[PDB]
Structure 1
Amino acid sequence: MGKSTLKHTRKIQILIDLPTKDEKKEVMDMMYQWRDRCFRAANIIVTHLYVQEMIKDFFYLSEGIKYKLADEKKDEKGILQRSRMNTTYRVVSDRFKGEMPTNILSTLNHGLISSFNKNRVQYWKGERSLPNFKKDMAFPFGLQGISRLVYDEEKKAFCFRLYRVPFKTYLGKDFTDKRMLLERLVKGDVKLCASNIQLNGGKIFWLAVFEIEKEKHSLKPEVIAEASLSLEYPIVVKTGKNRLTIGTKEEFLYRRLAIQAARRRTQVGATYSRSGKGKKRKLKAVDKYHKTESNYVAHRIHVYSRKLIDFCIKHQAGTLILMNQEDKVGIAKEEEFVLRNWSYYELMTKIKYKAEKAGIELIIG
């Protein structure tokens, strides 16, 4: 049987549940410590995974031995004293024990070794650099971190202990969207995957990864929906005599160009702002647009994707084909403006995963 669930990530805001300020500050300092140690750990993992492969390659070219990475107790030619994943986990645990819980490591190391194997051939060949994990990386954690999850009616918020630190859930005015999903996890009706935890300027965010089941619709795959993507009209869709124009040039392209105009306005004007105090202070004004472009284009892409899938659903268009997308990709790679200003990879992945969630099969021509 195939996977009946698709992964999803929700942003639930969680707040430290301690009565006083100094205890909250202690928790927050401990979590900044967790983030910093996790980033150091991830660097350590990728370096430690790069090193022994070069040891293998050096030995191979020196004396032609087919050395391999495995437990020597199970392989004659192996160079490692235990399983490789245990090697990286053990070295990182030894270097950083007693500061952050070891499940951050036991869930980070898996993610890094899984990706290193798939980038192995390119690291041997040489078109990729060793990842340089950033300091704002969210530290991942597993289900061993959630315990005693319950609904406390005194506070009307979900309460749990994330590694011996309590947390109430600040769902706010979300009594229908995620309030149900966590209730589904208290009593065992939804599955929670190993999640990530963000820290952004005094607010904690629990990027919970669930497994949302598909939605069985009244779809007729014989009905075919034709969509055309352009930087003049974002989405144009056909279904027999039914057509919906999704988005406008003014709303998407012209807004994005105005936003870039503001960013360039500010970059030009930053030269004569408060100087003599470092680069960060001068470029505070352009820090303001840290992620404004990405967020606006992201929301517009999401709205277009949802409107298109709703178009298919209301017409029961069980199969969607994106017309002539190969030609558009080809011509776009030659013109800088479209590639920079026509986010087609994000729109493509959004449409693919939404259509695969909703049961609409997507074919690209």
Structure 2
Amino acid sequence: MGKSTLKHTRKIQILIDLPTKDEKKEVMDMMYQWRDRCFRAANIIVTHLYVQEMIKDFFYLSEGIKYKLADEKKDEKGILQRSRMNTTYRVVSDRFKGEMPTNILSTLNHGLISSFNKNRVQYWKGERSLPNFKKDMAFPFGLQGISRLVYDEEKKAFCFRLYRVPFKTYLGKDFTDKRMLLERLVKGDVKLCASNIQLNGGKIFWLAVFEIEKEKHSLKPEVIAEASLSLEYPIVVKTGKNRLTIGTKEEFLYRRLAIQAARRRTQVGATYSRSGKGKKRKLKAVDKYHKTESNYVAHRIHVYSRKLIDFCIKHQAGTLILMNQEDKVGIAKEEEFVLRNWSYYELMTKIKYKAEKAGIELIIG
């Protein structure tokens, strides 16, 4: 049977459920320490995953031996004294046990092993570099960390123990969307996967990953929704006698141009701003816009994709054709207008995942 669930990541804000500020500050320090140790652990993980592969390379080049990285107790040609995952897990555990729960290590290690296998061909070829894990990496955690999940009616928050550190969920005015997802969880009706935790400016965010089942609508395979990038208009979609134009030139280009003008002005005025304190503070105003344009354009793409998907759903379009541009049977380039290709800012990632969750068959033309 095929996979009927798609992993979705919901930002659930959790606050530390302790009375005083000293204990909350201690908890904050503990999680900051977890982040630091996790970033160091990931760097160690990937480095130790490079080194033994290049040991195999050096031995093959020196004496032509087809050494394979595996347990020597089970393999004649193996250079390893245990399983490679367990090897690098042993090194990270020996270097950082007791400062953090070991599930952070043993869910980081799996995520990095599973990726290095797929990048092995490139790494031997030489066309990719070794990841330098950031200091602001959200550390992963498994199902084993969540315990004592319970809806507390006294405090109107979902309460759980993330590794003997109690937490209440600060959903705010989200009585309908994620208060339902968590109660579907405490009752064992929805699955949780390995998640992450974010630490931004004194706030704790729970990047919980779930398994949201496919939605069942009335989709007609014969009906075709021809969405064409007349890339003047953001999205213009054809379906029989139905035409919907999603987005406007002033709505995307002009506001992103205003934010661009603000960013360039901040860069120009940053040279004579408060100096003498490094690259960070001079560029503070510029950095504020480092993550305003991305947020705005991501929201625009989310809105456009959702409106396209809804135009397909309401009109029962079972096949969404991305009609690209191909302008004038492959004629030369025109002057310009606004959105470029079908994969501009992860548009074809968003459309693909939303259509697959919605069940719409997707074809790229």
Q: Give the TM-score of the pair, scaled to structure 1.
A: 0.96
SS of residue matched to 1:289? helix
| Pairwise CA distance, 1:113 | 0.3
Report if the CA contact (8 A) 2:301-2:345 is conserved: no
Report if the CA contact (8 A) 2:233-2:338 is conserved: no
Distance 1:301 1:15, change over 3 A: same
| Pairwise CA distance, 1:277 | 2.1
| Pairwise CA distance, 1:209 | 0.1
Distance 1:329 1:14, change over 3 A: farther
Distance 1:342 1:248, change over 3 A: farther
Q: Deviations over 1:183-229 (max 9, x none)?
A: 00001000000000000010000000000001111110100000112
Percent identity of equivalent pairs: 100
| Pairwise CA distance, 1:288 | 1.5
SS of residue matched to 1:161? strand
Distance 1:355 1:198 in 2: 28
Distance 1:128 1:119 in 2: 8
User: 1:142 aligned to 2:151?
Assistant: no
Distance 1:145 1:126, change over 3 A: same
SS of residue matched to 2:174? coil
Distance 2:328 2:185 in 1: 44
Q: Deviations over 1:150-190 (max 9, x none)?
A: 01011000000000100000000000000000000001000
| Pairwise CA distance, 1:232 | 1.3
Distance 1:265 1:329, change over 3 A: farther
Q: Deviations over 1:3-62 (max 9, x none)?
A: 111110000000011100000000000000001100000000000000000000000010
Report if the CA contact (8 A) 1:252-1:300 is conserved: yes
SS of residue matched to 1:288? helix
User: 1:253 aligned to 2:244?
Assistant: no
| Pairwise CA distance, 1:231 | 3.6
SS of residue matched to 2:195? strand
SS of residue matched to 1:18? coil
Report if the CA contact (8 A) 2:231-2:340 is conserved: no
Match of 1:300 in 2: 300
SS of residue matched to 1:105? helix
Report if the CA contact (8 A) 1:333-1:339 is conserved: no
Report if the CA contact (8 A) 1:235-1:304 is conserved: yes
Distance 1:244 1:340, change over 3 A: closer
Distance 1:264 1:329 in 2: 38
Q: Deviations over 1:57-111 (max 9, x none)?
A: 0000100000010000111001000010000111011011110110001100000
Distance 1:329 1:308, change over 3 A: farther
Q: Give the TM-score of the pair, scaled to structure 2.
A: 0.96
Report if the CA contact (8 A) 1:231-1:249 is conserved: no
| Pairwise CA distance, 1:261 | 1.3
Matches within 5 A, 1:1-365: 1-324=1-324, 344-365=344-365
Unaligned runs of at least 5 residues, structure 2: none
Report if the CA contact (8 A) 2:270-2:283 is conserved: yes
Distance 1:94 1:333 in 2: 59
Distance 1:121 1:329 in 2: 38
SS of residue matched to 1:341? coil
| Pairwise CA distance, 1:327 | 7.8
Report if the CA contact (8 A) 1:228-1:235 is conserved: yes
Distance 1:340 1:104, change over 3 A: farther
| Pairwise CA distance, 1:334 | 12
Distance 1:43 1:329 in 2: 50
Distance 1:140 1:169 in 2: 18
Aligned residues: CA RMSD: 2.3
| Pairwise CA distance, 1:329 | 15
Q: Deviations over 1:320-343 (max 9, x none)?
A: 000136789999999999799986
Report if the CA contact (8 A) 2:227-2:320 is conserved: yes
Distance 1:114 1:338, change over 3 A: farther
| Aligned positions, number | 365
Distance 2:328 2:199 in 1: 39
